[PDB]
């Protein structure tokens, strides 16, 4: 975010003074002088026309937040795990009925694509094109005052492409396609993995990035090479299949 605040001097650029009691009027301070429509009018009040607002906004409001790194990594891992559940990806609004399987891992040759047409052809080949088409078709003007605040167009989110090679040319080839987002495997962002705080982003992995995932996030047993001392969190439940436990031989006996 960028800070916003009203002018600190707004509503106070006057020498207005209260008339006191005894003149059958309110005690609010009033503009001095005469010969103009402004003379005698109230001032300085949050209830006065042309006055100062109550508790004027200030730039030193606490705009930012300092979340522990471990919690950030927990959230990123949770979003990555949710991206592998087809039900969650469907529940987040992505059209994945034609994708061969999840997680969607494609050959590294895609990283060398230079033209947007070739990128579209690759998307069609891997079965992810319908999601991009849905994103393009949702292009519309943002309702409300936001359309005059330099945020004029909104649309749905398409697939997120994750590549493992720095400087790959697919970033240029894919960036003009509406809804499509690209990110390097070593700097994954929760804001793109869970748009709007909702789990199940549709993700297309290059082979190299998928291979690097193990070295980046480690595992339960051993530690990560890229995150010093980090270990993936463990759930409170080893097996979340409640029916298997409730209807087991031990419990039912």
């Amino acid at each position: 975010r960028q800070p916003y605040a009203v002018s600190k001097k707004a509503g106070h650029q006057t020498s207005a003074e209260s008339w006191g009691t005894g003149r059958a009027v309110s005690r609010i301070p009033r503009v001095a002088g005469g010969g103009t429509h402004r003379a005698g009018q109230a001032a300085f009040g949050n209830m006065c026309r042309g006055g100062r607002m109550f508790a004027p906004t200030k730039i030193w409001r606490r705009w930012h937040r300092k979340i522990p790194v471990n919690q950030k990594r927990y959230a990123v891992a949770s979003a990555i795990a949710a991206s592998a559940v087809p039900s969650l990806v469907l529940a987040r609004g992505h059209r994945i009925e034609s994708v061969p399987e999840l997680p969607l891992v494609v050959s590294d040759s895609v990283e060398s694509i230079e033209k947007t047409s070739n990128a579209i052809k690759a998307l069609k080949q891997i079965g992810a094109y319908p999601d991009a088409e849905k994103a393009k078709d949702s292009h519309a003007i943002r309702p409300g005052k936001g359309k005059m605040r330099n945020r004029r167009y909104i649309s749905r989110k398409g697939p997120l492409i994750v590549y493992g090679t720095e400087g790959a040319k697919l970033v240029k080839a894919f960036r003009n396609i509406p809804g499509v987002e690209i990110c390097h495997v070593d700097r994954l962002n929760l804001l793109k993995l869970a748009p709007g705080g909702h789990l199940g982003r549709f993700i297309v992995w290059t082979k190299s990035a998928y291979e690097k995932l193990d070295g980046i996030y480690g595992s339960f047993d051993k530690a990560s090479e890229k995150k010093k001392g980090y270990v993936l969190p463990r759930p409170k439940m080893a097996n979340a299949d409640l029916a298997r436990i409730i209807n087991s031989d031990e419990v039912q006996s």
């Binding site: 005059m148 330099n150 960036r175 003009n176």
Partner: protein
């Protein structure tokens, strides 16, 4: 996506720049596409509209009308064509302003500078 740091995506700034443009800039802003034959011949897509250019309207109520441009009213962002007019309540005849982006140039008035500009435009397209 814009990347040049000295160009603004602000709606307010773009509108202000467009509506406060001087005449020299307005001339470029008042460009029109060339016809299919002219585009094929000159390998150029669009040109600034000139006074004595031959023009065919392609949009609006005068979609079929064509003629010679007779005035380029840059202050009003419109051009005037030979016979594209209307009758007032008085009965007198007045020209109807047409925006250049809504017309097609069928014949250009050629001079040394016009030919130089056409050659420059064709060179980049190669």
């Amino acid at each position: 996506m814009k990347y040049n740091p000295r160009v603004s995506s602000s709606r307010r700034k773009s509108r202000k720049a467009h509506f406060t443009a001087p005449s020299s800039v307005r001339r470029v802003l008042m460009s029109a596409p060339l016809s299919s034959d002219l585009r094929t011949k000159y390998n150029v897509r669009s040109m600034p509209v000139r006074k004595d250019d031959e023009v065919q309207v392609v949009r609006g109520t005068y979609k079929g009308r064509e003629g010679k441009v007779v005035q380029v009213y840059r202050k009003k962002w419109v051009i005037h064509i030979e016979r594209i007019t209307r009758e007032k309540v008085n009965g007198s005849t007045v020209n109807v302003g047409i925006h250049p982006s809504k017309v097609v140039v069928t014949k250009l008035r050629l001079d040394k500078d016009r030919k130089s500009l056409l050659d420059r435009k064709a060179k980049g397209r190669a």
